[PDB]
Structure formats: structure tokens, C-alpha cells
Amino acid sequence: MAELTPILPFLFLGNEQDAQDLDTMQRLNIGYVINVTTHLPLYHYEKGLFNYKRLPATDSNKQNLRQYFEEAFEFIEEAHQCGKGLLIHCQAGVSRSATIVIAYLMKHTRMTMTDAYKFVKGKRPIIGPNLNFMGQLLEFEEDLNNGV
Ligand SMILES: CSc1scc2c1-c1nc(SCC(=O)C(C)(C)C)ncc1CC2
């Protein structure tokens, strides 16, 4: 159907349809999945093939995603330290997951917010705006710069 975008060598971004292609996940050495939704299934759980973390969030104007940054950053590096890839997904438009990737690219690549967004948008061209998440990523940049 569709293709889950490599952002880093171990970090992939996709929507809900991308996360249901089991064969591409096995092909890419994916062993970790972050599902940034409250309501979807963890798509291949009963198969016993992957480590999962759910971030139960909505694509809304009131949703806090900063709370999950540090928890999500650990799961990404555990996949890195163990040499397996990680897929982080939500749904079409990937607003919630892209926020998390962008936060990771700021914290662990010392990119600026806007340059991290430009980077992600280059590899993954359709990303729905959400000003609430933007404001969170701005206040995360400042906290990261002024001693987080
Ligand atoms: C980190 S976003 C960012 S930083 C500087 C700009 C932007 C931007 N992003 C988007 S879409 C993506 C989003 O809004 C997120 C869901 C990831 C928060 N549309 C317009 C703009 C204006 C320029």
C-alpha cells in the first residue's frame, strides 16, 4: 500500500496503514513500535514480534505531548543500543508522531525546531499543521537550550 519513511537509520515515521504492513516491518529490521493514539490496536501484538509503547494522545488543541517526550526518547535509544529499528506512527497527517520525531531531533541531534521540521518534512512531505503541538515544540527548544 504505502511506505514508512526512514528519518534516521533506526527511526521510521508512518501512518496507521503503514503500520499494518508486517512484511515491510520485518524487512526493515523493525523491532520497536510507538503507537501515538488512544484508540487504534497495537497492530501485530499477538504475533509476539515487536516491543510496543503506546502514547494515548488525540490530535486536538488541548493535548499535551511534552509529557511523553522523555519516555519516547528512551524507547528510541533502546532500539538504537540493540540495533533494531523503531516505527512511530499515529494516523493520516502524522501530526502527533511527527511532533515526537521532531522533539527527538531537537534533543538528540541539537537541531533547532524549525530545522528539525524542515528535515522531517523533506523526507515525509504531508504533515498536518497543529499549532498546539508547535507551541509545545517551541517551549521544548527553550527548555532544552536553557538547561533541561
Ligand atoms: C515543528 S512545526 C514548524 S516549526 C516552523 C514552522 C512549522 C510548521 N509546521 C507545519 S506542520 C507540522 C506541525 O505543525 C507539527 C504537528 C509537527 C507541530 N506547518 C507550518 C509550519 C510553519 C513553519
- Nearest-angstrom CA–CA distance, 24 and 20: 9
Tell me the C-alpha to C-alpha distance, in Å, between residue 38 and each of 5, 56, 89, 91, 125. 22, 4, 12, 11, 25
Q: Distance (Å, rounded) from C-alpha 70 to C-alpha 59?
A: 19
**Separation between Cα atoms, residue 129 and residue 148, nearest integer Å:** 26
In this structure, which amino acid lies at residue 51?
N
132 lines ligand 1 (CB under 6 A): no
Q: Which domain holds residue 118?
A: 5-145
Report the number of distinct structural domains present in the chain. Answer: 1
CATH at 62? 3.90.190.10
Distance CA 36, CA 34 (A): 6
90 among known catalytic residues: yes
Distance CA 30, CA 51 (A): 9
Q: How far apart are CA 88 and CA 98, in angstroms?
A: 8
Rounded Cα distance, 104 and 19, in Å: 20
| Ligand 1 centroid – CA 21 distance (Å) | 28
Active-site choice (90, 94, 105, 106): 90
Mutate to test the pocket of ligand 1, among 134, 138, 140, 142 (most ligand atoms within 8 A of CB): 134
Structure-block grid coordinates of residue 38: 488512544
Question: Maximum CA pair distance of the chain?
Answer: 44
Q: Residue 18 CB: number of other CB atoms within 10 A?
A: 21
Q: In what order do the strands lie in the sheet with 85-89?
A: 5-8, 11-14, 85-89, 30-35, 51-54
Yes or no: say if 91 and 16 are a contact pair by the CB < 8 Å rule.
yes
